[PDB]
Structures are given as structure tokens and as C-alpha cells.
Amino acid sequence: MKGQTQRSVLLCKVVGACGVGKSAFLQAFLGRGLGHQDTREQPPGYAIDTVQVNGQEKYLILCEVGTDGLLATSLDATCDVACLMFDGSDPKSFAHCASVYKHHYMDGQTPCLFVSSKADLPEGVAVSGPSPAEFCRKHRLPAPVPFSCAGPAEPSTTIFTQLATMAAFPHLVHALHPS
Ligand SMILES: Nc1nc2c(ncn2[C@@H]2O[C@H](COP(=O)(O)OP(=O)(O)O)[C@@H](O)[C@H]2O)c(=O)[nH]1
Ligand SMILES: [Mg+2]
């Protein structure tokens, strides 16, 4: 039917440098913010839970993948959607994240979502250009999504529905004129 897919299980790789918040992001997928985390439920570097996509229950696997040092080149990029994470409070974070995209995903068919982590902290701009938003406009990616794991409030679930939807229907992801 329209809006349905044979896929029951979707794979997202959460790809980013050490310290950008990948492990906390996986915990937030399971409904746990900073401190409220709980390690002994799922394997390290993995988080699985159900996500609704157009009324249908899907399983989304988040798979944590580092990019520090040699990992920036020694990357198995295969996944249904790549979540490219950079530290929104770190001036130097985005450039490394953008380089990973260019070398592994830029001219592929895998949907990519840039995520600006630690949105609760004071923002950290880079000295050179371009901005993360300008980079995504040029390479025709979605606008980078800010995310935060802190606060006493429950973590938002919107970005995980977005990742699951991109994974389920990879041909309807885009940047678009007119809107
Ligand atoms: N303020 C804040 N700190 C965060 C957030 N996410 C992660 N951190 C902290 O940043 C550090 C690295 O996070 P971690 O999840 O281990 O990153 P990883 O190395 O990419 O897996 C830890 O001290 C976290 O508590 C966030 O949204 N806000
Ligand atoms: Mg980690």
C-alpha cells in the first residue's frame, strides 16, 4: 500500500567523533536523558526500540560509530540512514563531520541527517565557513537538527521518527524550490 514498506527493521548509523554525544543520543532514543541513562539493558554502541512510521510499527537500530583518527577513513558506511553528529558547542566539530560526509556519503544514495548535539550549551561557531546550515543547503541535505539530552524534561522523540522515516523511504528525502 501507499506509505507502507516491507521493511520491519531499519538501521541507522550514528556517526561522529569521540565526545560529541553519540552514546547519550542512543540513550535518549530509549527515553533517557543525561544522568537517567541505564547501561545494562542493551549492548554497548546499540539501541533498538520501536518507532511509528505512517501508522506502522518499525524497529529502528541505532548503531554508534566513531570517526576519530583512523576511523574517519576506516568506516563501513553501509546503513539505511546515516546520522552525522557534531558537537554544537564545539567550534571545530563540524568541519570533521563534514569531511566524513564528503568522503563516505556525498555522492551515494544513503540519506544523511546532520545533527547538532548539545543544543542546551552555549553555541560554538567555527571561525571559517561555511555554517552547518549553509553546508547542507549547498550539498542539498536537510537542515541540521539541533538535539539536547540535558534538562529535567524528557528528551524529544521527533528526530528518531525523522530518522526512521528517512530510512524507510529513502527516495523522498531532499533539501526544495518552491517549498
Ligand atoms: N550538556 C550536554 N552534555 C552532553 C549531551 N550529550 C552528551 N553530553 C556529554 O558529553 C560527553 C560525551 O557524551 P557521549 O554520549 O559519551 O559521547 P560519545 O563519545 O560520542 O559517545 C559526556 O560527558 C556527556 O554527558 C547534551 O545534549 N548536553
Ligand atoms: Mg560513546
Side-chain angles (χ1 to χ4, degrees), residues 22-24 64:
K22 302 183 298 297
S23 290
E64 177 175 347

Side-chain angles (χ1 to χ4, degrees), residues 141 157 172:
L141 311 157
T157 71
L172 321 170

Side-chain angles (χ1 to χ4, degrees), residues 77-82 84 100-112 139-141 170-171 173-174:
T78 304
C79 58
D80 299 318
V81 58
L84 308 177
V100 168
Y101 167 80
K102 296 177 183 175
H103 290 111
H104 292 285
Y105 296 108
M106 181 168 55
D107 192 42
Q109 290 289 273
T110 298
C112 294
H139 297 74
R140 291 205 99 221
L141 311 157
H171 276 341
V173 64
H174 56 281

Side-chain angles (χ1 to χ4, degrees), residues 78-168:
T78 304
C79 58
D80 299 318
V81 58
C83 177
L84 308 177
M85 180 167 295
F86 66 96
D87 190 335
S89 69
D90 197 331
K92 298 179 174 299
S93 188
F94 177 77
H96 179 76
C97 190
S99 182
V100 168
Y101 167 80
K102 296 177 183 175
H103 290 111
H104 292 285
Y105 296 108
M106 181 168 55
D107 192 42
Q109 290 289 273
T110 298
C112 294
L113 183 62
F114 277 75
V115 175
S116 184
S117 66
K118 307 181 184 182
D120 56 286
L121 296 185
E123 300 141 71
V125 282
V127 309
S128 78
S131 68
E134 165 152 345
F135 180 95
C136 296
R137 263 194 304 268
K138 286 154 167 280
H139 297 74
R140 291 205 99 221
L141 311 157
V145 179
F147 191 82
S148 176
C149 293
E154 226 182 13
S156 180
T157 71
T158 300
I159 192 171
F160 307 107
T161 300
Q162 171 171 14
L163 288 169
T165 305
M166 296 172 67

